[PDB]
Ligand binder design. Structure first.
Ligand SMILES: NCCC1(c2ccccc2)COC1
Ligand SMILES: NCCC1(c2ccccc2)COC1
Ligand code: NA
Ligand code: NA
Ligand code: NA
Lengths: 140, 144
C-alpha cells in the first residue's frame, strides 16, 4: 500500500469508472474469451512496453498469449478518475509467472476509453524489466 | 511536433485543460523543457513526492529538487506532447510523449508516458510518471 495514496480518489464515481472496476475484477479470471466481451468492435489494447493490438480479434489473441505464462492474481486500485470519456487507474497488479511460481506487485497507471459502456481503448503504462527480473522471466 | 497516435481520442475536450489544476499541470509540462530543477520546484508543496516509477521515489521538497536536478544532468526534455489530460478528486492525469535526449550519448527518444499529479491548493503534492525505462535506455545507449 503506497505511501503516496491520496478520499474519494479511490472510489469509482460514474458508470464508466464502475465498469472499469468491474473489468479489473474480471481480469483475475485469466480468461481472454470472457474478457473480450468488455471491448467494443472499434477497440485497441496496449501494454505499453509491447506492441499494440487493434480490433477485438487481435486484442483477444494478445491477452490469451499473456495469460499462457502469467496469472493476474489480484488488482488493487489506489486511484480512479475520469474526464472526457477516458478513465484513469493508478493500481498494482499482482502478477504471478506461471513457469517460475514467482509473484510481483507491478505498479501500473492505465487509461481506458469507453463508448456506450464498452472499452474502445486500454493502455497500461509500467516498467517491464522490473517485472521480468522479479519473476525470472523475460517477456519481450 | 509529434505524430498523433492512432488511439488518440478525437473528442477535443480530452486533450484540453478544463480545470485550474489541469491548467497548472499543462504549464508545468511546458516548464519541464527549461531543464531547471529550481524553476520546477516552485510548483511543489513542502509535503510532496516525486517518482519516475522505474526508479526510487523522493519524498519532501528538498529530495525532489535534488532528484530533478540529478535527472537534468543526464537528460534533457526537449519537448512534451500531451494527448490526453483529465482529473478527478484532486488528481490530474496526463497521457503524453516526452522527447528525451540523453546528454552523455547525444541520442533522443520519444518516450510514451502516463503521469499522475496530486494537487492541494494549487501546489504539487505528488508527481509519478509511468513508462518503460529499458526501451529508453536501449534507444539512447545509456544504461540507467
Ligand atoms: N497491462 C496490460 C497487461 C496486463 C496483463 C494482461 C493480460 C494478461 C497478463 C497481464 C495487465 O497488467 C499486466
Ligand atoms: N518520467 C519522469 C521523469 C522525466 C524527467 C523529469 C525530470 C528530469 C528528467 C526526466 C519525465 O519524463 C522523464
Ligand atoms: Na475517484
Ligand atoms: Na473529471
Ligand atoms: Na481533457
Amino acid at each position: 500500500q503506497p505511501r503516496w495514496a491520496s478520499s474519494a480518489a479511490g472510489a469509482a464515481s460514474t458508470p464508466d469508472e464502475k465498469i472499469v472496476l468491474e473489468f479489473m475484477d474480471a481480469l483475475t479470471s485469466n480468461d481472454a474469451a470472457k474478457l473480450i466481451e468488455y471491448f467494443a468492435e472499434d477497440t485497441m489494447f496496449q501494454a505499453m512496453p509491447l506492441p499494440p493490438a487493434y480490433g477485438r480479434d487481435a486484442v483477444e489473441q494478445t491477452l490469451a498469449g499473456l495469460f499462457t505464462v502469467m496469472s493476474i492474481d489480484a488488482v488493487e486500485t489506489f486511484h480512479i478518475g475520469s474526464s472526457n470519456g477516458l478513465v484513469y487507474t493508478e493500481r498494482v497488479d499482482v502478477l504471478r509467472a506461471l513457469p517460475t511460481g514467482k509473484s510481483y506487485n507491478l505498479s501500473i497507471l492505465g487509461v481506458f476509453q469507453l463508448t456506450e459502456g464498452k472499452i474502445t481503448g486500454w493502455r497500461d503504462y509500467f516498467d517491464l524489466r522490473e517485472f521480468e527480473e522479479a519473476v525470472d522471466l523475460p517477456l519481450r
